[PDB]
């Protein structure tokens, strides 16, 4: 499937109708495995640190999210396949332009590479972008070979506003997920009992992200 057809025939209608869109077998097993090695290498070489919160108050970040992460630009040596993933995500989003709600997506974060090190770690119910920080689309790539959610947990459960059913996303190998980052999609990472890896990029709406930067720079 070309990006153009995936974007226009699937991602766009799916995002506009449901606000949550899964693409399985996104890059293929060979590229998926390479990404998984790069992530293992980061993990093994002690690159990960505690996942942080936008606004840190009295409780530890670890009470809220049990993952450890690093940020990847995609050009670092030994991270080139993550960079290919990021370009592939970018390509999809660029082919969606002007058709994802009324968003105009001009930019994104670096990739957040995140590991829940089993042990019942997860992420309490949250909204990625509750207060208008610019993030309009959350994009997650999973790379967990041999994941059995009934035994190892780690389900991403999303509660799409107004819907008769919540969405349970297993963190399955080579699975790509898009969802609106705002309050339409509260979500949680249910406790994980094996090592769970995912790479997240957030896409920014130009106008909202500009306002967010303004509020922050004069906050």
């Amino acid at each position: 499937l070309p990006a153009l057809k995936l974007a226009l025939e699937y991602i766009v209608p799916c995002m506009n109708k449901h606000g949550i869109c899964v693409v399985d077998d996104f890059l293929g097993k060979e590229t998926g495995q390479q990404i998984g090695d790069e992530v293992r290498a980061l993990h093994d070489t002690g690159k990960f640190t505690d996942g942080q919160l936008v606004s840190q108050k009295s409780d530890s970040s670890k009470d809220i999210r049990g993952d450890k992460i690093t940020w990847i630009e995609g050009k670092e040596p030994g991270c080139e396949t993550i960079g290919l993933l990021m370009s592939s995500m970018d390509d999809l989003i660029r082919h969606c332009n002007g058709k994802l709600g009324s968003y105009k997506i001009n930019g994104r974060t670096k990739a957040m590479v995140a590991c829940y090190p089993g042990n019942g770690t997860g992420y309490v119910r949250h909204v990625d972008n509750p207060n208008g920080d610019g993030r309009c689309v959350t994009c997650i790539y999973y790379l967990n070979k041999d994941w059995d959610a009934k035994v190892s947990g780690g389900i991403l459960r999303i509660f799409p506003e107004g819907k008769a059913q919540f969405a349970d996303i297993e963190p399955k190998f080579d699975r790509l997920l898009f969802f609106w980052s705002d309050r339409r999609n509260p979500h949680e990472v249910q406790p994980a009992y094996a090592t769970r890896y995912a790479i997240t990029v957030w896409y920014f709406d130009a106008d909202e992200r500009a306002r967010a930067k303004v509020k922050y720079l004069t906050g």
């Binding site: 919160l53 997506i105 001009n106 509750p130 997240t200």
Partner: peptide, 20 residues
């Protein structure tokens, strides 16, 4: 109601944003 930013995943809020 809770400030939901206290639960939201951190992102760099200036000068780390990749332009597509």
């Amino acid at each position: 109601e809770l400030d939901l930013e206290t639960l939201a995943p951190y992102i760099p809020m200036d000068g780390e944003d990749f332009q597509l």
